[PDB]
Design a binder for this molecule. Structure first.
Ligand SMILES: O=c1c(-c2ccc(O)cc2)coc2cc(O)cc(O)c12
Ligand SMILES: O=c1c(-c2ccc(O)cc2)coc2cc(O)cc(O)c12
Lengths: 115, 115, 115, 115
């Protein structure tokens, strides 16, 4: 698992469950092309998006459908989604955890990069 | 003024109005002594807590009554308050803005230090 | 003004000065069209992006060039930028403050919506 | 494990390792009495602070020594520490994760409450 996504809910104090997540990689004509997707589990985690072989250096976008999440809970949200855009670099072996903390009118995102 | 507190509500996307704020200063005997207090305004800001003459070097505590805020909106929050503890003016007089962003189960705090 | 952007540096405890900000609006053909741009001031604020006449209903994107900011301070950051995407003015004209708090491997964004 | 603490570093994009954490419970004379402590592991986590039998309803404080952490990395910090103060309540079976995201001049904390 070179890439994992974890989503938390700051209103309820819980994992954010069944949140749709899409991953894109930047193409040479500088358009975004779909790469991987899924929904967060009961622990708010999304595992198995990609493999070591496929996850090469490049520019990636992780888009989290926060609007549909808040809509399901009956709470008015501000953002259309949360986008996280980064360059993946080989130095040594790497694992990426993209964590997002969600509120209706705010979100925070951090990258935890290990190995 | 040397010390200002600004509080935001991450659920409503608004200033957090009428929030109680209590400031304490550490004495020589290592106890917390009452220093200043007030309520946030319509803009979520609290000005005029202290003066340049009064705000000497020391360790200060700013305690924001987040629990009473959430409860008056019908929400039972996780935290009792948001507490910020810091050493002030140790390389000379500065101006401090203490900002807090509030959610029922989470908060962030930042300091902007100038001059 | 209808739209203001404020950027803070969580490492230095200061406004984030000279930060590039680009605003886009979604067209009928679903592409992003350039709307407005500017640089944050000494206070980390960007005022005067648009007017009440120009800032109609739609989906907007605010892209903050966080990478160039960190690089000029000698830090190689994780994210390419901080991107905020939202529907504006759909229940009538409002005033929007978009705040971003920056760290090399993390950022938070909040909206304060009034009037 | 009814109570776990997890600490992240927003400057380096990593677990915050070897951070001292102290837990207190509020006594009837309203003084803070030490309860449990330890240091975060290589994954930034602190497990085994207490047991189901000992962790009764009450008011608790978790104090994270953020200042010593930043000092070890050679970076000037603002806060003396991060304090998280909450009421533990029995409803159904509960697990508490107190997560903290650290920057030199800012911190965020969230509670993830499960089972
Ligand atoms: O710090 C903030 C924040 C802010 C943003 C993100 C956070 O995590 C915390 C506070 C929001 O609006 C402001 C508005 C201000 O006028 C001054 C500020 O310092 C802030
Ligand atoms: O809460 C977080 C955060 C996190 C993210 C943003 C914040 O503002 C605060 C914490 C990051 O990684 C985690 C990773 C975890 O396994 C559990 C968590 O609760 C978190």
């Amino acid at each position: 698992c070179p890439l994992m996504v974890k989503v938390l809910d700051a209103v309820r104090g819980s994992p954010a469950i069944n949140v749709a997540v899409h991953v894109f990689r930047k193409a040479a004509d500088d358009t975004w092309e779909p790469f991987a997707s899924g929904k967060t589990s009961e622990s708010g985690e999304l595992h198995g998006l990609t493999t070591e072989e496929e996850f090469v250096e490049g520019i990636y976008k992780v888009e989290i459908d926060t609007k549909s999440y808040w809509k399901a809970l009956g709470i008015s949200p501000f953002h259309e989604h949360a986008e996280v855009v980064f360059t993946a670099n080989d130095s040594g072996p790497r694992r990426y955890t993209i964590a997002a903390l969600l509120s209706p009118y705010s979100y925070s995102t951090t990258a935890v990069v290990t190995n």
